[PDB]
Amino acid sequence: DKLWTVKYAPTNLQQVCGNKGSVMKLKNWLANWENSKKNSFKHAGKDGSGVFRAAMLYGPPGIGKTTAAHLVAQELGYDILEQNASDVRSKTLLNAGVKNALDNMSVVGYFKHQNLNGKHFVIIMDEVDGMSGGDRGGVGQLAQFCRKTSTPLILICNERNLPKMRPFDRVCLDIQFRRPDANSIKSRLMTIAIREKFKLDPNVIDRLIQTTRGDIRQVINLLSTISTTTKTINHENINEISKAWEKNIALKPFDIAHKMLDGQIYSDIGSRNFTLNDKIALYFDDFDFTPLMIQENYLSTRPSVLKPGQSHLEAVAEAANCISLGDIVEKKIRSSEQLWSLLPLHAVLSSVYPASKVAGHMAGRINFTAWLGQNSKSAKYYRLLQEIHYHTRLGXXXXXXXXXXXXXXXXXXXXXXXXXXXXXXXXXXXXXXXXXXXXXX
Amino acid sequence: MASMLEAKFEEASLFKRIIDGFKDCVQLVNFQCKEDGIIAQAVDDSRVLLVSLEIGVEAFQEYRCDHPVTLGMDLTSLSKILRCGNNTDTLTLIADNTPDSIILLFEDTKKDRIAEYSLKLMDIDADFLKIEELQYDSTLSLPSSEFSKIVRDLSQLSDSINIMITKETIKFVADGDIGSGSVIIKPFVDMEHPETSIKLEMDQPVDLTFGAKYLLDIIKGSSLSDRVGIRLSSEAPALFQFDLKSGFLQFFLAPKFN
Amino acid sequence: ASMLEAKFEEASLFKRIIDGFKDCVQLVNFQCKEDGIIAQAVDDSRVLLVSLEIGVEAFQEYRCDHPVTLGMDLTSLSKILRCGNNTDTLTLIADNTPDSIILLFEDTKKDRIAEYSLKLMDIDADFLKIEELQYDSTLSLPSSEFSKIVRDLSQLSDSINIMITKETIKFVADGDIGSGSVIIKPFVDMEHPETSIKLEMDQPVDLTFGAKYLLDIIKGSSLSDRVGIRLSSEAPALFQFDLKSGFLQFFLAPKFND
Amino acid sequence: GLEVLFQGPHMASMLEAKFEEASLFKRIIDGFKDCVQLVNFQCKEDGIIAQAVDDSRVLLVSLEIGVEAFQEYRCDHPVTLGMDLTSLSKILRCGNNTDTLTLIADNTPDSIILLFEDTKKDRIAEYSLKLMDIDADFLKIEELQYDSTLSLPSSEFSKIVRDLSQLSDSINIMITKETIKFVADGDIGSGSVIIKPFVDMEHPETSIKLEMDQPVDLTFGAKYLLDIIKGSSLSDRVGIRLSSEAPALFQFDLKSGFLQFFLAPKF
Numbered sequence A: 001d002k003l004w005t006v007k008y009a010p011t012n013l014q015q016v017c018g019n020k021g022s023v024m025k026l027k028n029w030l031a032n033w034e035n036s037k038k039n040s041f042k043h044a045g046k047d048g049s050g051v052f053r054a055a056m057l058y059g060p061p062g063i064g065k066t067t068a069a070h071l072v073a074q075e076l077g078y079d080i081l082e083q084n085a086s087d088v089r090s091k092t093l094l095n096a097g098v099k100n101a102l103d104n105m106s107v108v109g110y111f112k113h114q115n116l117n118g119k120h121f122v123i124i125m126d127e128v129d130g131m132s133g134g135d136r137g138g139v140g141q142l143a144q145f146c147r148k149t150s151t152p153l154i155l156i157c158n159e160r161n162l163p164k165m166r167p168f169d170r171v172c173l174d175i176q177f178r179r180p181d182a183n184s185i186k187s188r189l190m191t192i193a194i195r196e197k198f199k200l201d202p203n204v205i206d207r208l209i210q211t212t213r214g215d216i217r218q219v220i221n222l223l224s225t226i227s228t229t230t231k232t233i234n235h236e237n238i239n240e241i242s243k244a245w246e247k248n249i250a251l252k253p254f255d256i257a258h259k260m261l262d263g264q265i266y267s268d269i270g271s272r273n274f275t276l277n278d279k280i281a282l283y284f285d286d287f288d289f290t291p292l293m294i295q296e297n298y299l300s301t302r303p304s305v306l307k308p309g310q311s312h313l314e315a316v317a318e319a320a321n322c323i324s325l326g327d328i329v330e331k332k333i334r335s336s337e338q339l340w341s342l343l344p345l346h347a348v349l350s351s352v353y354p355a356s357k358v359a360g361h362m363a364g365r366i367n368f369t370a371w372l373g374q375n376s377k378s379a380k381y382y383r384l385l386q387e388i389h390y391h392t393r394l395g396x397x398x399x400x401x402x403x404x405x406x407x408x409x410x411x412x413x414x415x416x417x418x419x420x421x422x423x424x425x426x427x428x429x430x431x432x433x434x435x436x437x438x439x440x441x
Numbered sequence B: 001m002a003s004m005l006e007a008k009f010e011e012a013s014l015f016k017r018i019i020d021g022f023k024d025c026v027q028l029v030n031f032q033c034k035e036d037g038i039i040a041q042a043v044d045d046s047r048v049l050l051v052s053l054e055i056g057v058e059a060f061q062e063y064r065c066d067h068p069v070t071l072g073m074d075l076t077s078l079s080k081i082l083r084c085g086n087n088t089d090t091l092t093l094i095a096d097n098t099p100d101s102i103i104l105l106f107e108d109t110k111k112d113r114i115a116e117y118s119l120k121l122m123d124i125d126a127d128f129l130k131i132e133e134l135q136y137d138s139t140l141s142l143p144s145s146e147f148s149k150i151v152r153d154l155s156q157l158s159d160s161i162n163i164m165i166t167k168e169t170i171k172f173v174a175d176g177d178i179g180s181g182s183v184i185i186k187p188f189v190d191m192e193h194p195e196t197s198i199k200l201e202m203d204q205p206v207d208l209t210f211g212a213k214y215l216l217d218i219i220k221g222s223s224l225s226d227r228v229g230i231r232l233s234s235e236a237p238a239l240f241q242f243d244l245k246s247g248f249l250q251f252f253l254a255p256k257f258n
Numbered sequence C: 001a002s003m004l005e006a007k008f009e010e011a012s013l014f015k016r017i018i019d020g021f022k023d024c025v026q027l028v029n030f031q032c033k034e035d036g037i038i039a040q041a042v043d044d045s046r047v048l049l050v051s052l053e054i055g056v057e058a059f060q061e062y063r064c065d066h067p068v069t070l071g072m073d074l075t076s077l078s079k080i081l082r083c084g085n086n087t088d089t090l091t092l093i094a095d096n097t098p099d100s101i102i103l104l105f106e107d108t109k110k111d112r113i114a115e116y117s118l119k120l121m122d123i124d125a126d127f128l129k130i131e132e133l134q135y136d137s138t139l140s141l142p143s144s145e146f147s148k149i150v151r152d153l154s155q156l157s158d159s160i161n162i163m164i165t166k167e168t169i170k171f172v173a174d175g176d177i178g179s180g181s182v183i184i185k186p187f188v189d190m191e192h193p194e195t196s197i198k199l200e201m202d203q204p205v206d207l208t209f210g211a212k213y214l215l216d217i218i219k220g221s222s223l224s225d226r227v228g229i230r231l232s233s234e235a236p237a238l239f240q241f242d243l244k245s246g247f248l249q250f251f252l253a254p255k256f257n258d
Numbered sequence D: 001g002l003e004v005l006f007q008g009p010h011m012a013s014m015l016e017a018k019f020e021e022a023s024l025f026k027r028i029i030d031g032f033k034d035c036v037q038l039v040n041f042q043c044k045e046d047g048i049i050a051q052a053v054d055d056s057r058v059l060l061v062s063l064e065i066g067v068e069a070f071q072e073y074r075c076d077h078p079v080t081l082g083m084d085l086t087s088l089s090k091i092l093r094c095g096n097n098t099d100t101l102t103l104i105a106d107n108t109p110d111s112i113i114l115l116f117e118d119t120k121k122d123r124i125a126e127y128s129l130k131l132m133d134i135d136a137d138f139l140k141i142e143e144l145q146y147d148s149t150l151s152l153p154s155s156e157f158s159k160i161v162r163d164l165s166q167l168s169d170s171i172n173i174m175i176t177k178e179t180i181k182f183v184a185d186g187d188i189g190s191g192s193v194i195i196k197p198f199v200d201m202e203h204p205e206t207s208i209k210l211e212m213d214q215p216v217d218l219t220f221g222a223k224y225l226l227d228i229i230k231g232s233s234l235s236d237r238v239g240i241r242l243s244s245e246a247p248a249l250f251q252f253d254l255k256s257g258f259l260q261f262f263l264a265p266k267f
């Protein structure tokens, strides 16, 4: 009846697939909070989680952040007072609302009372990187609370390295959540399936995760599509329903790359059963991923379409070039909300053409696009190198920094005696080091 | 001739004053309706103030309500509606079986004017609390108009207001940055006007501090009863109560840290 | 000599008048004649048009030999009009082909002369069009009794439907939070003729309007103590506000409803 | 516990002034509350003397509460009490109708006490306000003779100012041929209110007294005048004096003393 992500939502931190390291880091902080307070938050314990009034969770969509924060709170007996983007968190309302609970106790904490925190709040300011123009000065006031609160404060966001999030930098314990581990999600998904009365090839359960880029919430929803679609599952159906489901609802981006890369469609015969018009049309079946898909695996095929006496390499270079050209086209299509009339050309230059040059037998296997997550790595690191520059600009363009900050690595990693010497003799602090350490790594 | 609940407020203005009494700190609230009357509790958005209502069958010129029904409704919407009714009007609550809405009939003596409004109910998953009559260290009472002035005055000085009951004496203090605010009132009873008398049944001293914002919100019940009951205890939320000819509107305010 | 000599019995008159335009209408060219003043204008949406007619009967003296064209801004004019005490008398004064109109306030005991200048607004437009002169239904009620029903329902919808059925004036509004319906009948209180409600019907009427405008309309409730309303399917509704020697009338277009 | 007795009454004090009526002071401060922000209230054995010049530095307020405004007054040594009117306003809003207001300060003030006493002693309220340290400005007792001197009801004067202030940001005042004129040339139009010296006998309250010596014509900032009229909350009629070189003087008489603004013309 209820969505699956709901009915199968963790009930104990003992069910959060992944980030277990960060969950611990979280739970701890929420434990030593009373003491951290007792000590005026000036004793950064062996964890550092001691000089921070509030914690800042962050990471990709559907990986357990909101589940952890809530759960870690309910586990230490505290009562929860949460807000999110659906609420108005402007500086005005913020100061006329929650500001008042920063040093207050739960009225529910009484009619519930052995609980040691039952009468205390854990403020969960969720979806903070979602505070728009409907929250004037919200981040500022919120970042000010991280310094003057008298109760645990937990903030969640997806992009910690954003400009809007700058005011939060030095003010709180930011624990990172990365994309859960496949085995974790694979194991979890299995458990689900079993309880849902069905089985699935570990190769299917595997590529899903790969498509979902780790979004455990998405896979769960995506996995509830089978039983919800068909009326009655049977002994045999299980093995075949995967097809219609996988090649349609689930891994559709794959059945596209498959068809597109099948040489049988480019041979004189099939060449007219599945016309040029159809090949181009396959593109409009997911014009979002199709270009990414072809580029991803146009070089992992055993071509059957090569002209007589044409090497696999040569034909690839031709598609390589076309892939390149199609890009030029895309950029322009995305430079003017009014250029969609160029998509057909892009269909040809980014998929159909490159494909026809190497279509045939599938040597390896259709892989999801590497470009997306690969675009996260590069981006998430430019932000780092950036803040590092806006700290060394005192001592070359941000570019000349990553192409000259090589020597620095030595006199900052070399042996790790002369510790303090170089470190401080650089005008760097704690975060100035922890940050420069990440990228350099 | 088609309902499971049909109450008829003696005075329309009543139900309004009753709801304007707490529609600023609570948004969604479940109204439990049964034989004897209407009961409803709701926690604050900041989870600091608990609000409890109780409307006895003696406030309606006629009160039906066959089976027990839950009326989860948004006070802002309901408030817009009640705002409609005029003076000479007999507000009648009407609810069918397993309602999706609720009707509010504003009739008039002169049967030449009838105005009925429908109000879509809300689905509220109320965290029902177990309120239990406790033995508070101190129990005072005074004119609501006075408690109001005191609270409004002091709130201009601090975000916190300390209420001290020492040696049978009521003392409110507010210490801010611009300065401090102190008010003290001694019990008495004026036979001339019993309603302006300050009571006080102390059994043990009490020193609690409340958020000024929540008191400014509680004093809004100062339109239901000319007097306000306050029960304080070092280990429990304060209790501010307003008396209604057939019930009451009470507030449970959790204190601040020591 | 003044080609336009207009003295209002009471400066407090021309004040209640312009309050009708002020909000819904932007600029209004005032055309004067030998029998009084007339003016019209329309919403930038072309949904509502206002028609003003001021007769000399509401003047302590009128002399506009040759007709004039006084274009002016209500926000600017409404200001000049507030600078009048309840003991003064207003006097419109314009020369041959006005380049700005003059308002004169004066007392009757102490020498106090308040003369304000006011540039004139020329928009190069003077389209005065009226065509309806016979509606399927005519009703009347107190301007205050109306403005109420209006703002009440405005809370639940962007549209209000004035449904005229067999001797029953019905106002309805259906929206997101709920519905609202006010049904008042034609009644007369021998002791209070003003609060009486008259309604003469011929053919049923059913037409919805946009509360937006309907609201700006009930502001003319300042011009009188009773509003007249004439309806006719697929035809702009006419809301008229009676005045001793003239009137302020609003022509509001409905909405195609099928 | 047992020290729950206010301090104000029992402390060693150099200043202890009880008002005739709380509201009086409440009203006073309001008359100049909007112009100034921080003022130094110099208390002497004779009464209270306060002055202040707006940030723009073109308006000057001068208060003076004579010892006659007090039920009992005993300041026995010159003390300067700087304080923010915004805070003062708040304290002053806590006073009831049947409540007496006593200003108290100790021989070494770091703040000021405002004690509210009631008929039924059952209600005592003590507010303390932290003093501010302002650079006190010496009295500008300059009484340059003004070319013209007039007075009219404060209620009727306020409107004039407020009404014309709609037309322009600069109100003009002329005293030509023993006749008072208020001009306002704005963007949309013009305004002109003229009042001659009128003297009623049945209602002497409402009268316009004038004294012409030299033709007058001055222009001040309306924004300012809008605040100046606030004194309308203390005196029934306000007296104005205008000079060709000296700023404008608007006075609101009070039994004990008076509130007076010294606005400098805009050139």
Ligand SMILES: Nc1ncnc2c1ncn2[C@@H]1O[C@H](COP(=O)(O)OP(=O)(O)OP(O)(O)=S)[C@@H](O)[C@H]1O
Pocket (backbone or CB within 6 Å): A004, A005, A006, A008, A009, A010, A015, A016, A017, A018, A059, A060, A061, A062, A063, A064, A065, A066, A067, A068, A157, A158, A180, A216, A217, A218, A220
């Ligand atoms: N790490 C995880 N372990 C187990 N189940 C998970 C995990 N992450 C997500 N889920 C499921 O996904 C649903 C939503 O997860 P949330 O923790 O609310 O996501 P989130 O990381 O806050 O995502 P946002 O709001 O898009 S940032 C839950 O109710 C779970 O069923």
Ligand SMILES: [Mg+2]
Pocket (backbone or CB within 6 Å): A065, A066, A126, A156
């Ligand atoms: Mg979330």
